[PDB]
Every structure is written in C-alpha cells, then in structure tokens.
Amino acid sequence: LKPEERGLYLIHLLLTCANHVASGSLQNANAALEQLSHLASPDGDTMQRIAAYFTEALANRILKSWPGLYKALNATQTRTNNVSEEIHVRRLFFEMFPILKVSYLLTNRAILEAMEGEKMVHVIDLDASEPAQWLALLQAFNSRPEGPPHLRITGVHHQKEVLEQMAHRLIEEAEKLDIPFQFNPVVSRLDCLNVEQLRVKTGEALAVSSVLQLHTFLASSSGRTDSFLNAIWGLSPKVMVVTEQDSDHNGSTLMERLLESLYTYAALFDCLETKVPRTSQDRIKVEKMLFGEEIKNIISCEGFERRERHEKLEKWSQRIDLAGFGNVPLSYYAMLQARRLLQGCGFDGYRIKEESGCAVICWQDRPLYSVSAWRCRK
Amino acid sequence: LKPEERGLYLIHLLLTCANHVASGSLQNANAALEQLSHLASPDGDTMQRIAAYFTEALANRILKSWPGLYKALNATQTRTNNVSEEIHVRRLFFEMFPILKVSYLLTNRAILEAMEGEKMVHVIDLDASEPAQWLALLQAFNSRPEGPPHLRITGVHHQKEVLEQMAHRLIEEAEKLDIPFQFNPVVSRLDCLNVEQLRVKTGEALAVSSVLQLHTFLASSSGRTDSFLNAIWGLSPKVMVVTEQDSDHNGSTLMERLLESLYTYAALFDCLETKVPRTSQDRIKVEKMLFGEEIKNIISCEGFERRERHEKLEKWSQRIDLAGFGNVPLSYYAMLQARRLLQGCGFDGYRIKEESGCAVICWQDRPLYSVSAWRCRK
Amino acid sequence: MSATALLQKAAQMG
Amino acid sequence: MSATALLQKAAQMG
Numbered sequence: 170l171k172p173e174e175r176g177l178y179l180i181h182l183l184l185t186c187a188n189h190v191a192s193g194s195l196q197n198a199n200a201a202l203e204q205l206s207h208l209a210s211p212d213g214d215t216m217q218r219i220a221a222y223f224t225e226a227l228a229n230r231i232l233k234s235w236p237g238l239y240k241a242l243n244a245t246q247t248r249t250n251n252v253s254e255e256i257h258v259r260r261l262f263f264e265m266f267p268i269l270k271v272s273y274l275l276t277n278r279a280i281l282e283a284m285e286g287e288k289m290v291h292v293i294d295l296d297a298s299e300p301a302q303w304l305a306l307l308q309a310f311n312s313r314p315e316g317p318p319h320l321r322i323t324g325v326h327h328q329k330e331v332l333e334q335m336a337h338r339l340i341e342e343a344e345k346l347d348i349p350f351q352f353n354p355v356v357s358r359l360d361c362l363n364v365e366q367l368r369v370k371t372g373e374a375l376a377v378s379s380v381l382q383l384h385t386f387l388a389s390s391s392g393r394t395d396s397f398l399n400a401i402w403g404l405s406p407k408v409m410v411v412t413e414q415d416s417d418h419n420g421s422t423l424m425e426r427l428l429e430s431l432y433t434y435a436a437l438f439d440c441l442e443t444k445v446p447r448t449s450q451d452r453i454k455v456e457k458m459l460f461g462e463e464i465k466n467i468i469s470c471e472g473f474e475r476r477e478r479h480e481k482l483e484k485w486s487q488r489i490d491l492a493g494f495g496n497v498p499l500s501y502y503a504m505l506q507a508r509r510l511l512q513g514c515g516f517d518g519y520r521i522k523e524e525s526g527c528a529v530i531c532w533q534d535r536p537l538y539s540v541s542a543w544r545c546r547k
Numbered sequence: 548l549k550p551e552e553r554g555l556y557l558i559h560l561l562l563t564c565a566n567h568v569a570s571g572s573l574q575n576a577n578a579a580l581e582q583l584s585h586l587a588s589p590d591g592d593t594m595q596r597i598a599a600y601f602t603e604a605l606a607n608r609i610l611k612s613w614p615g616l617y618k619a620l621n622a623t624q625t626r627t628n629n630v631s632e633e634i635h636v637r638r639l640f641f642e643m644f645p646i647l648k649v650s651y652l653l654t655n656r657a658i659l660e661a662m663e664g665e666k667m668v669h670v671i672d673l674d675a676s677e678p679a680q681w682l683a684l685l686q687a688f689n690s691r692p693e694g695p696p697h698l699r700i701t702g703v704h705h706q707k708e709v710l711e712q713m714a715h716r717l718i719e720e721a722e723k724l725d726i727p728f729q730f731n732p733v734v735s736r737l738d739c740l741n742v743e744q745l746r747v748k749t750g751e752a753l754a755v756s757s758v759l760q761l762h763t764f765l766a767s768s769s770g771r772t773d774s775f776l777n778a779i780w781g782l783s784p785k786v787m788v789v790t791e792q793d794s795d796h797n798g799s800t801l802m803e804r805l806l807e808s809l810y811t812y813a814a815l816f817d818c819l820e821t822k823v824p825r826t827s828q829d830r831i832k833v834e835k836m837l838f839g840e841e842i843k844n845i846i847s848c849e850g851f852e853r854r855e856r857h858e859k860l861e862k863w864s865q866r867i868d869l870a871g872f873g874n875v876p877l878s879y880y881a882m883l884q885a886r887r888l889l890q891g892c893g894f895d896g897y898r899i900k901e902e903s904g905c906a907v908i909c910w911q912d913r914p915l916y917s918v919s920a921w922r923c924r925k
Numbered sequence: 926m927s928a929t930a931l932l933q934k935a936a937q938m939g
Numbered sequence: 940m941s942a943t944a945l946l947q948k949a950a951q952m953g
Contacts, residue, residue, distance in 0.1 A: 176945045181953075195573075195613070203615030211623050215942040221622045228619035235573070237581030241606035244599045245589050245835055435942040442942075457623055535943065554931045559939075593928040813928040820928075913929065 170208075176216035179208055180431070183223050187427050190231050202228055211453060215442045219435055222461040223427070226468035230423070233469065252330045258458045259298055261451050266440070267516045271507045271530055272380060272540050273302040276410035278503035279542040280376045281309055283408035288318045289373040293406075295359060295382045297324030300335040302378070304342055311346045321351045323367055327358045359385055360393075364400055377401055377409040383485070384413060387478035398492035402545055408497060409543045411489065414479035415529055415536040418467050430467050434460055436535035444515050482527060482539040494543035498526025548586075554594035557586055558809070561601050565805050568609050580606055589831060593820045597813055600839040601805070604846035608801070611847065630708045636836045637676055639829050644818070645894045649885045649908055650758060650918050651680040654788035656881035657920040658754045659687055661786035666696045667751040671784075673737060673760045675702030678713040680756070682720055689724045699729045701745055705736045737763055738771075742778055755779055755787040761863070762791060765856035776870035780923055786875060787921045789867065792857035793907055793914040796845050808845050812838055814913035822893050860905060860917040872921035876904025 186201035202224060209220035232239050263269045284290050290310075292303070303322055310317040322339065326332050332354035343350035355366050359382055369375060386394040401409060416433040420426045437460055445452045466477040490496065504523060511519045522529040527541040564579035580602060587598035610617050641647045662668050668688075670681070681700055688695040700717065704710050710732035721728035733744050737760055747753060764772040779787060794811040798804045815838055823830045844855040868874065882901060889897045900907040905919040 173940050173945070176940070176942065177949045180946060180949045184953075195616075199613045199615040201615070202619040206615060206618035206622055209622055216945055219942060224619045225622045228616050228622075231616065232620070235577045237577040237579070237584060238573075238606050238609065240584035241580040241602045242610070244584055244587055244603045244606075245839055247835075432943070432946055435946055439941055439943050457625075461623055533943070551926050551931070554926070554928065555935045558932060558935045562939075594931055597928060810929070810932055813932055817927055817929050911929070 172214060175208055176214070179205065179216050179220040182208075183220065183227070183427065183431070184424070186224075186227055187423055190227060191423055193234070195231065195234075198227075198231055211457065212447060214447075215435070215438050218456055219431070219438050222434075222456070222464045223431070223468065225461070226465040229465060229469035252328050254454075254458070255328075256298075256331065256334075258454050261455050262459060263299055263301065265445065265451065265455060267511060267513070267519055268530055268538050269299065269302075269380070270510055271521065271528070272412040272538070273305065274507050274510060275499055275503055275528055275540045276378055276380075276412070276542070277302070277306045277309065278500055278506075279408055279410050279497065280306065280378075281313065282500065283376060283497075283544075284310075284318065284374055286315065287374040287407075289321075290318045291321040291323065291369060291373045291375050293323045293325070293367055293369075293375065293377045295325050295377070295379050297322075297326045297335050297354075298331055300338040302380075303335075303339055307339070307342055307346055307348060307350070311348055317346075317348045319349045319351075321353075321373070323353055323355060323369075325355045325357060325359065325362060327356065329354075329356055332356065364404065367404070369404055375404060375406040377404070377406045379409065380412045381414065383411055384419075384478050384480060385476050387419060387480070388474070388476050389472040390419065390478075390480070390484075394488060395492060398489060398494070402493045405545055407544065409489075409494060411485065411539075411541050411543065413482070413485055413539055415482050415539040416479045417481055418477065418479035423468070426467050430464060432535065433537070434464060436532045436537065440518065440532055443518065481536075482524060482529065482541065485539070486525065486527075486541070489541075489543055493546050495546040496526050497542040497544050499523075499528055499540070499542060504528060550592060553586055554592070557583065557594050557598040560586075561598065561605070561805065561809070562802070564602075564605055565801055568605060569801055571612070573609065573612075576605075576609055589835065590825060592825075593813070593816050596834055597809070597816050600812075600834070600842045601809070601846065603839070604843040607843060607847035630706050632832075632836070633706075634676075634709065634712075636832050639833050640837060641677055641679065643823065643829065643833060645889060645891070645897055646908055646916050647677065647680075647758070648888055649899065649906070650790040650916070651683065652885050652888060653877055653881055653906055653918045654756055654758075654790070654920070655680070655684045655687065656878055656884075657786055657788050657875065658684065658756075659691065660878065661754060661875075661922075662688075662696065662752055664693065665752040665785075667699075668696045669699040669701065669747060669751045669753050671701045671703070671745055671747075671753065671755045673703050673755070673757050675700075675704045675713050675732075676709055678716040680758075681713075681717055685717070685720055685724055685726060685728070689726055695724075695726045697727045697729075699731075699751070701731055701733060701747075703733045703735060703737065703740060705734065707732075707734055710734065742782065745782070747782055753782060753784040755782070755784045757787065758790045759792065761789055762797075762856050762858060763854050765797060765858070766852070766854050767850040768797065768856075768858070768862075772866060773870060776867060776872070780871045783923055785922065787867075787872060789863065789917075789919050789921065791860070791863055791917055793860050793917040794857045795859055796855065796857035801846070804845050808842060810913065811915070812842060814910045814915065818896065818910055821896065859914075860902060860907065860919065863917070864903065864905075864919070867919075867921055871924050873924040874904050875920040875922050877901075877906055877918070877920060882906060 182201055182205050186198055189198035205224040209224050210217040211221045324332050324335055336352045339352050386397050417429050418426055441452045463477045508521050520531045527539055529536050530538045560579055560583050564576055567576035567579055583602040587602050588595040589599045702710050702713055714730045717730050764775050795807050796804055819830045841855045886899050898909045905917055907914050908916045
C-alpha cells in the first residue's frame, strides 16, 4: 500500500465513518474503525498520526451513544493528578511552537503602552500557567524611562502547584529587579470564578490577559460569554488582551467540525513533521496530550462538555465589541518585533498577518491563532 | 434504597448482564450496565466495590465484541511504564495480607530442609519481586548449625528496576551476613524464558520457587504447562515450591467463572472491609491494581490473553505429579509457625488447613491460596 | 451484612 | 506529500 494512497484513504475513512456515526449504524461504523486502526498510527507519518487521534475521537463519540456501556467502562474511576506531566507538555508547546512567545510579546507591549505614566498597575492572568509571560514584563517595567510602578499580578489557575511555581519565580525575579511587586494566587476553575475573588482595588490601573480561555464560555452563540465579558467590562480594565484559536471548530453538525478541524490540525501536525523527528517523545506528548485532547473534545463531546469551541477572529470581534469594548490596534513595531521573532531557529514557515488592528499567526497559509487588544467604551 | 437491598440487587444485575453478554444483546446489556453504574462504587461498601470491578470487566468484554471499536479506543496507544506504582502495590499486598509471609515462611523451611548438608545451593526465583522472601533465608542459612553454604539466587522478572532493587538489597545483607553469595538477574517474561538463561551449574543443589506463576502457562487443560514443568523436571531440582490461587477460575463458560470469582473476591474484599477504612488509598490501590486487574482478566479476556487461569490445588497436584514430581509434605512445625504468624496484628479470620501434605490459606471458610512442595521422581 | 453472605442469600432464592 | 495538501487533493475529487 503506497504511503500517499494510504493517506488519502485515511481521509475517506474518517468522513465515511463519521457519516455512519451520524446514521447511527454501529456495524457500519465498526467496520470503518477496523480499517482505520491498521492504517493509522501515532508513530507513522503526518496523516497516520492525524487519523489516529480522529479515529479515537470518533470511537469515543459512538461509545457515548450507549451511556450504560460508557459509564461502566469507567466505573472504577481513576481519579488522578498528573500535574508534573501537564506542566511539562505546556513547556514543550511554549518551546516547540512560537505561538505563545508572539502572544506574550504582543500583549506585553499593549499592556506597557496602556500603562504609560501609571504608578499602580494590576494585571489579571486568567490562565497563570507559564511565568515567562510576566518575567519579561517585569524587566520591561523596570527599564521604562519613568521607572517601574507598583506591580500587582493576580494569577488564576485550577492547580496549586502551577501557582506555587509561578509565584516563586515571579517574586524571585522581582526581588532581583528591585520592583515593588505582589502576587496573589486564585485557585479556581474559570467558570466558578467570581469578580470578588480578583480583589481589585480602587485607583489602580488594570489589565486583563485571556490566553485561550474565552472560547471556554461558549459551552452549554452563547450567553455565558456575554456575562463574563460584561463582568470584565465592569472592572474597567485599561486594556484587555485576547489570544484565541482562529478556526471555526464550533459548527453545528459533526461533519462541519470534522471538516474544518481536519484542515487546522493537519497544519499543526505539519509543523512538527517538518521540524522534529518522528521518534521524538516531545512531539508525541504535544500531539497526544494537547492536540489529541482538543480533537477528542471537538469531535466526541457535546453541550457543556465541549469546551474547545474555537471560533474565528471576526466572530470574537463582534462578540467583544458588543460587550462594550473598543479595539486597540496592535503597535506596528510590536508587530515588527513579532515577525523578527519568527525569523528564529525553527520558526520558518510561520507568518503574521494584520487584520483590523489584530494579529493572526499562520502556518503557511493556514490561520492558527489571533491576538487582539481591547479597551472599555463609554 | 436499603444498603442490603442494594447489595443483592447488584448481584442480580451482574448475573443478568452476563446472560445478556452471552446472548449478545447490546441493548439489553447496556441497560443492565446503566443500572450498575449508579449503584456500584469503588468507594462504597464491599458489594458496591465488587460490583464496580465486575461491571467494568463485563463492559470490557462486550467492547471486545466490536474489534474495530475496541482497537480505535486505543489507537493512540499510551505506551507507558508504571514501575514505581506497581512496586508500591505489591508492597501493600505483602503488608496488608498474610498470604506472602505464610508462603515465604513455608517455602523457605522446605528449601532449608532440602538443603541440609549441601555446601552449594542455587535458588531460582521465577518472580523476583519481593526481596523479603530471600532476606530471611539468608539469615537462616547463616544461623544453621553447619554454617552457611555458598548461596546463588537467580531472579527472573520483566522489569530491570525490580531486579536492581532486589540485587542491591540481597548483596547488602549478604555482605553484612558474611555469606558467599551471588545474584544473577534474568530480564525476561516467563513464557520467553529458556532453561539456558538460568545458567545452572553442575554439582550444585537446586531449588525452584514458583509464586503465583504456574497458572500463567494454562493460556492458549494445557500443554504449555506440561512443557514448563517437564523443563523444570529436567533441571533436577531438589525441591520445587509452588504457591497458587486455590479457586476454579478457569471454567469453560463466562457464567462459570463469574459465579466462582464472585465468591472468591467477595472474601478477599471482605478482609479489607473488616480491617481497613473505606477511605484508605492503600485499600483502593490493592482493590483496583491487583484484584481489579485479575477480575478484569478473568471476565473480559479469552485465549492466550487470559493469564489469570486459577485452578484448585487438586488439579495442580495431578498436573505436577504427572510431570514426574513427588509431593514433599510440609513440616508440621513449619505449619505451626505459619499459624502463629496468623495470630499477628490484623490477621485474625485467616486459617491454614492441611490437605495431603499441603497448606491452604483460607479467609473464614473460603480457600484463597495453596502452598505445596515437590521433589523429582525416578 | 457481609458480601460473602449476601452471595449466599441471593443464591438460595435464585 | 504534505497532509495539508492531501486534504486538498481528496476534497477536489470527492
């Protein structure tokens, strides 16, 4: 079986099986899944790896069609904590892809420019997982001509160990940088988060950073997102910076989301193929623990259980602008610095496109993520 | 719903679902599994915990009826090593149950009595996981009136880390005990093990210890077991000590194995209930990682994949005696020492019954494990 | 209400 | 033989 004939046949199987899933024919879906199992492979080429995670996702969805069987398969629920591995895979994403470095650079510039002249700055991090985002902003605040303001950072995360490492690293750097700095952790999932927990004081300039968190609220195009954006609006932030996936993965039907997500993750899996060896354990961890989980959630989950409801930038702009925010175009030279970052080792093939004052991070011609800055209107 | 009404209803569901499994009605089996999910619980009472592992097992078996769906559920095969946890759960079994301590005591006595006067002793451990078995034999050899012989121990296991810890602990004790001692590890699964790998020399007295390993060869009442016992016979061991489960879990049909295994593991789960709190993480680890895996393998696997083919002592005696071995009755006072061991803290309820020169470790009236010693005939 | 006795109580009536 | 191009080749004929 030719490798190129193997790849295209895998695509047909995915669409065919998905139709059998929608039709509900378990016999016809099982036969399609049997074929996928022998051809797909997490160690194979790009299409074999892509097929492996979409195949597992599709099989998980039809497993949910029998709730008794699905639950019984987890009756001995393996309640567990895998924090160290999850920190490790996030570090790999930060280092093997330029997405977060570009996002951090652009959002830190937008915050610094919003905090010109402010002596009291409070930054709210809705996903405080990587301390590299604020370590750079600490040095930049210290280097700014007017000297550093009093900096306060509120970190929100659902795991204490993640907040302990960030707090330790940020206090250690701020103590070296001689910056008056305060970090208060907030242990909470984002849905149960209340404004009162953020403990914002009066008279301090505020900035909100939402890295890949806004689409979470679209789960059961949403009313939960409106309430959260309005809650953020009431806090009167001087700037809100939003980093989101730039793909329509929130389509109504299974076939809709399968078609688009196949194109998006084919691009993401393509970067690793052109850069990292097939035998790399780092590559497999990222492909499984990150993209595989997102693919599985997009394909096999519904209702509130489907949190990876990615939408394009144009939808987010309307949604955020209707919530009372005005767009703050990213700095031309911040965009130039982000492009120079892409000239780094192993970042060729990426491109940054400007779209209505916002940045779109692309692989080849395929959009992947967007970065946008917003201020309160009225 | 009354707790006693909950327990008996769980039993009916298990037998009912199993019939639907045999009939092959997925709709009828799914409805039975749906009921089990809400009533069963790994944290509940004894029957809730028992039902949880048999429910997951039954659901796994009917999942195998659709190989395409079953394989696709693991297309992204999580190839992993969990050695540290597996060592931990084996330590818990050794400490929370008196099974291994009684086995080790009885087999070490049989070896010592077989090695009276021998100056060169070679012991072969087919599952060299717990060094406590040979640490005691080291001291006993050193204390025997004629002084210690040259001791050689060959350890067989499929994980290097297990053999490294045993080797380190045994050499450390032998160096303190001033015993000429040699430990050669053999990294292999038991099926791929060849006699040549054991490297037995001529003129040295030999003993073979098989702790819960003989029933492995019954997988596709067997011809693989005969060849292994005959291979052991050809090595001319002075004594072979066998510790095995004493339950008929190798029945032909699913309903056969389900009925007996329900009674066996109800007793095993009963010990933990009368001794260890419901919230103990140690208890859950043993119940899941050990009994749960055995229950799952007995109920959901077939052919060579079903390795936990437990049979009663009477079947093993015929099988071993036909292979050319003669029974060596256990010492009356070794049996007395094993009973005194059961007078230890938390070992009440256990009993040791003598059966044709062999020992049967029981909980209440339910047999659990057997210990028997054998020598070569002709 | 032991599980080893629950099995005995169910098997008689079944 | 990139995967992002395989999807393009299959979608045209399908």
